[PDB]
Every structure is written in C-alpha cells, then in structure tokens.
Amino acid sequence: DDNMRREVQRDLLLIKHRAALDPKRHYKKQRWEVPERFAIGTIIEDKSEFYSSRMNRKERKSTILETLMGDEASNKYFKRKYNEIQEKS
Amino acid sequence: RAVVLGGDEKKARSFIQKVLTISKAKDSKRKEQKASQ
C-alpha cells in the first residue's frame, strides 16, 4: 500500500542490511531492492518440531525487528560495536 | 517534520539507526581493503 506502514519499511531495511546484524554470519553479495509486489508471512513449524524449531509464544512478535530487540546477545554486540564506531568518528 | 513519539517507537527508531551506522562502517571497511589490494 502506498504510504506503507512504518513497521514494514523498517523490516525491509533489516533484510537489506542483514550482513551487519551478526558478526559471525556473512552473505553472498547482493544488491537487494524492495520488490514491486511482496507479502509478509509467519512460519508454521511441524508438530514434530516442537523442541527443535519452535519459538515460545511470548517471544513471538508482529515484526522482525521487535524479535531482534528481544535477543540479548544481539543487543550487547550492537552496543559494543556502536560505541567503537562513534569513538572513531 | 516534527512529531511526538511513544517510548516503544523511539526504541524502534533508535535501534534502526544503530544498525545502519554499523552497516555503513562494515561496508566502507570492506571497500577500503579491496581497494588496497
């Protein structure tokens, strides 16, 4: 929808800049543009995957970013990395 | 434009800027090394 909701815009930024989210994870070089048509979906695990690949209900969030804030390890890394860049700046 | 924001939206806006500066720093560093080679 034109005048897209802010949470959608801010999630599309996370996929575009996913290379910086985790120090240990690296990606194939890709110039990802926002597609003309797309959908936001929620994954459905199999019942056999109750332990291996299921999130708890409280951890689940409407947006991708709000889950990323919940991760404590991610927040600690971002705080440390952010300070170093500002010190250099 | 000036706006008035709630606490959660400020945290969401604060987080996304932190990510964007880290991406810009990681990209520029990646560029500089490949330029040196």
Partner: peptide
C-alpha cells in the same frame, strides 16, 4: 522515513 521526521517535546 526516520531521517525525514524529527522528534519534539521529548518526555
């Protein structure tokens, strides 16, 4: 659009 907007009357 976070860059376009600016926050005022912070609380």
């Amino acid at each position: 659009e976070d860059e376009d907007e600016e926050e005022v009357l912070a609380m």
